[PDB]
Design a protein around this nucleic acid. Sequence first.
RNA 1: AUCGAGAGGA
Lengths: 490, 32, 56, 391, 49, 270, 120, 70, 46, 49
Amino acid sequence: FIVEDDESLGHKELKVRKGHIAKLMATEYQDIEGGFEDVEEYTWSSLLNEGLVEYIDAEEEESILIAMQPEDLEPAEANEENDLDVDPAKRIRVSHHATTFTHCEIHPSMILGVAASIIPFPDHNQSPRNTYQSAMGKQAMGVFLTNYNVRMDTMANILYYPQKPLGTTRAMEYLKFRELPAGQNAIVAIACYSGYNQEDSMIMNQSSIDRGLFRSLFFRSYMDQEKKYGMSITETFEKPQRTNTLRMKHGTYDKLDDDGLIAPGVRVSGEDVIIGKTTPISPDEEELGQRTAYHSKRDASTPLRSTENGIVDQVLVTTNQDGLKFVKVRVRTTKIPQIGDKFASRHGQKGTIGITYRREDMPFTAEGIVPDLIINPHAIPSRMTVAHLIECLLSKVAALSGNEGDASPFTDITVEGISKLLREHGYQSRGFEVMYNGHTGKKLMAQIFFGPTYYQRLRHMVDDKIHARARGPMQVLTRQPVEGRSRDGG
Amino acid sequence: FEDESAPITAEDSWAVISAFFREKGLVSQQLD
Amino acid sequence: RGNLMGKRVDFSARTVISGDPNLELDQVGVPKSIAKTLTYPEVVTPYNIDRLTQLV
Amino acid sequence: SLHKMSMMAHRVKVIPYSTFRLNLSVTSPYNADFDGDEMNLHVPQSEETRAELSQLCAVPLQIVSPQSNKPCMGIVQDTLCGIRKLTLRDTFIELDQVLNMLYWVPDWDGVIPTPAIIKPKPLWSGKQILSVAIPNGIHLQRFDEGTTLLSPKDNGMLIIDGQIIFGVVEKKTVGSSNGGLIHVVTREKGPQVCAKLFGNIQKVVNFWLLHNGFSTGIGDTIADGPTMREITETIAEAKKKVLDVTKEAQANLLTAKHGMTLRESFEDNVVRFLNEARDKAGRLAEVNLKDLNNVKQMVMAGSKGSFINIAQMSACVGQQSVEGKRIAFGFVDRTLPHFSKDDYSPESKGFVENSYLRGLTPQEFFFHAMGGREGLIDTAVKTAETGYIQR
Amino acid sequence: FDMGGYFIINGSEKVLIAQERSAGNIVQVFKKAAPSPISHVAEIRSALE
Amino acid sequence: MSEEGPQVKIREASKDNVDFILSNVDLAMANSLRRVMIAEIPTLAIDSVEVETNTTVLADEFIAHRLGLIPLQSMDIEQLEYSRDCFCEDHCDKCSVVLTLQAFGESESTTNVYSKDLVIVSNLMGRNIGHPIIQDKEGNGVLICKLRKGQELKLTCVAKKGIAKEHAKWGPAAAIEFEYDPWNKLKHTDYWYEQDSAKEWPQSKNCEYEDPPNEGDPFDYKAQADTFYMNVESVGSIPVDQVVVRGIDTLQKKVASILLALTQMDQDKV
Amino acid sequence: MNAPDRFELFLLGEGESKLKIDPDTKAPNAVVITFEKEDHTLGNLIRAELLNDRKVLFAAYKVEHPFFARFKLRIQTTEGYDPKDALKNACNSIINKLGALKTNFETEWNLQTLAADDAF
Amino acid sequence: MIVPVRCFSCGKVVGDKWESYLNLLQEDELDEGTALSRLGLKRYCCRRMILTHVDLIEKFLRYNPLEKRD
Amino acid sequence: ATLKYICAECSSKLSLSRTDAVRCKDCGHRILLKARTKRLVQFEAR
Amino acid sequence: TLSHLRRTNTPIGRDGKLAKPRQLHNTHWGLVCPAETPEGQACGLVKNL
RNA sequence: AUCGAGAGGA
Ligand SMILES: [Mg+2]
Ligand SMILES: [Zn+2]
Ligand SMILES: [Zn+2]
Ligand SMILES: [Zn+2]
């Protein structure tokens, strides 16, 4: 923003006024509505050309003096040292220090990146936690595009029911997180329990998994095209015959079609062949003709990955730029949460499932509400992440009152406001609830911090990591075992 | 009054930010 | 340093870990899918013909 | 695999669900947690190597390590909190739950201890049921600052013939300490008995804690109004002292400390004052906190808590620094374009008045990010430099 | 919802990562190590853009 | 633990809630009844799905899961055998109900395919089972999927009898409240507080049915948990009253099975 | 991958008896009974009832591992009184009380039907 | 993508309340909380389910559905 | 039978055969999604 | 996707030197994210607008 | 298959 002394009526005041904001909102609504009549069609360029905002480079911003917020300009702060707004629940903000302001921040929290600006209350966490969350928000499972069905991408992961957060920052409207969210709201209980969430692991309600919690789709597209060589040879799709080819793979060819492809809807598992392709190549010997007639053909099929199974989603048959037949086969499968899977909130709190408990075995409140997670209380003190608890509280209040909780970084929403709202909703101000053991049904002598919160299902599922071997393939040079899980390496 | 006075408040800067992201977008630098 | 001082080995497994308050200190939990891949060669002696034959 | 204990021999137990499962007390040796860690399994292929693994590398034989004379395995988060809460003086147990606790100890000899309270109601103390897990013939005589065989604080430990007699059980006793229960039992009854003790204590304490419960909420970081005002006055006094030092330095009346020029002496005085302010505010908050406060309970149990965390969550976060020096004038004579040039005030050079509960202003947020980035870079460098030194 | 600031090459989608560099046509004066026979050096990476 | 024991007092009743005070019974029995209502009352649900054709947006697993989660009438479930206890070939009329869903985009606007469109094609033999539970005021069931003009979906859903332990989709209960001792007289709970627990902790709605503690009265250390307040809510597949009655039946059956096992072991010992 | 079928929680497997009574050598007249395919729902009930018998000296249970739907119960009665008899009496008392509860609930709901028919 | 059936944690059938919820929001101009209460979503376990749902099916149904004339 | 190869951005059911041009007859397009199978797919509603 | 399309990279640190660069300089205020930076060798060398 | 590069994880 530009700060000028145009206000001869008083102290140096911001250049932008409420009329400009009114016209901007009018332009927004005119875009939303019909009957275009917004002659004063302000956009960003209108503000830029009108002399209301700048484009300040790091080199130019050395010579200026910026105000953190428009309130820093009011003469009252400069002069009125005494005021009744001594709410002890608000941040201690330094007073008005200067009067030669040249510009004013459009808003703090625009200093954050795309992955950071989806953190609720990042200013209540500590910076390492924020960095961890920014790194782990790119692994959260969610809908990356609406046309994922058309795209034949390899390794696409999509949630069954992606849910919008109950605590949303104000930049999520520009990042479109609320339109393509990556995660789900889970009723988390920060409790010490049977002991299976003792380290950063966690407990998951099994009956919540059975009803569709954190279920995700997985897509994997296989590709194969007829080889370029057309000079008296080629490599064509077909269904190889046990009696007319070499080293034909150990998998099942019974699932293929006459086209060398599996029809969509077939259930493929293990190392079954999905694309049937052979090389009618040498040995070009008439002795082979005396033997199996087409013995010259050598199998070039593509089997499923040995550690994967699913159902053929879609088979695409096109021709590459060179005109040779080109094929893509997509296999989809549902990846339900298991014990070894990895989840995390928006505060760098990693954790794998430790054990799943059914709805009856979980602790329950006097209202029957059972948690979808039980997080060990020992993750908080060392990592702090106060934003986690503030987000759980704000989310509880938002779910009760039925609206969105503004988790913007540098707003003026204090824990005491949220607590007052929660108490108005007939609950304990700080979010504690009396729970029952479940096994015995007796009250727990401790009251459990209960409420919703947004958790993300990351990548790194255990079934993609589990690997054992004993006397598998070996190398050729050193005669040691090969490396790689996909190759059955040691 | 409002047109020429009533200075901006904290909540009003989000109209400006929305205008910026409307005209520019999140990948404006590469396209430009 | 990559083929003599250290090398890939057979009869080994890797996977995520979890916790079990109900496991002995020296005891570990091996998933069935892993215990059915790794093997131990036992010699047939008159003390274990029956059990080893049953395993066969 | 930094040391011996990162390679230990275990006994197998085939289970479902695709993850290796470990006892929670062996995590510290491997330095493992369950946030996504993975481990490698190796199977011996000969009776010779099976015997070598089970007679040399066996986990119970590794409890007391030659690195420091003290145990490696100890008692960890949930068991630590549960054992400190269970052995409190006010924790009595009914017959119905005591029967389950006793049946949960495999070594239990079938003899029900006579309750500590008999006539009005039969109530067993937590120390009794925990002692049922301690083998006979074990003595400890640890005395803390104010332990005199009658102190009301239980700040001590006395065991006579495998019976907790006095004191709370916490990280100083069952944790991997120099002369705790673990070390004494290993050096007295042997490795197998100590591993069995690990199992028994874990089982009993986990059962009790499951049927009691224990949580942490946002209400654990809040300090009442009076202590918040006291913290604010402490911080204001520190700010005033720093301002007085600044006035003295700007008047040239400050005398440079020998071995340091004027600027370094001034910066040292300011950083010392700010650190004293943070410590005083943190102590005020901590003494305010009740025993109800779950964070303070974790701190007292030794179960992953420290008082610096309490200070930073419920009071001033404190001065930030990069390269050992308070934030530097990256711009021309100012740390950030929102401050006037040549400003040495605490707020302009990294100090963070607020707490994490209360929030951070944008400048404090950025300075804290600076400090966090410094820490992360240091960790990344060590990750490899220490490995090279090891090799 | 696709922003679209990328290329499609052989089907695959590629992103040109902004390569950071020190500016040219700026005079930078910096101190050389004392053991060296040079005290200060002023450096320009002059370029006709 | 004598015969003429537990007494009941139904505070209020609906068709999706039964609110009652359960008194003169141990806490173990109350909790066991709660757990049984949650976990071990058989009901009907879709178990197998044969997708004849599906050009819709949703995948086949998605729709199969949704269909499994649709409640179905289960008043007469006790007259249906378990598919594991039948001699048929993967289903028949006496151990399953066969529904079939067929939808198409006749209209150019979005077509809402939903559980009103499920039709039972098997023979129910007069049993009161198989009907999807439609409680919507619009008469519309549970939204299953949506269709463009050309999209189609043909299914064959086989309904089977099961308990919530095998899969949560067979649960007859939605959520069971449970409380005892509104005023913490038994001191089974210690109240976390800052300045005053009696002010910081909201008063339970059941505190009106109990005498407030007397400030001077000594702690009645001989008192035991009793007079449990419960509120069973039913997803609609079974009436709430029948949910509770069948929970009691299931506990009785489990204990009777224990007795029968003891008797069989004794007979084997002779 | 390694997830066992959910039916293994309540369906007996091959050669898996419902009960297995093993006399306990730690104390006299004490036996340990293992219930297969059972959990706390019945174990807590049985133990709580057994503790109401004045001829029972000890009664405790434990589910050794949540992975396996198993259950172990220890009973130690006074001299003469066979622990199996104590278990039988426990089950019989439980059944009687459950039947009484069902009868009372049916009676109360029959009374309430007048309002229920007018409810939703 | 579609409104979830059978609320996760508790199991209440919140799948038939999407249409009614939207109608109350739009036609009756009710707030989210009042609309949720009017449908009987007593406890936040279900209010989060209905409230924070993202109906992506409406966006998938914009692409041509392998249809004879579309 | 040779029923197969539904066309993309169209609806034509090509039912091509070996050596047939991969182009769609009346679209000129070259994608030709392959005709979801005929055998019933068995799913468990879980 | 959005983060990748708005990423940068500093070839200078590819040498692996351990020094004052690859730190959050305070001239970065409002120009690159103070929190979004990878771990390992690239911490502080890869920066996000 | 090979080699090279990048991404990320413990
Ligand atoms: Mg870790
Ligand atoms: Zn049948
Ligand atoms: Zn619900
Ligand atoms: Zn066409």
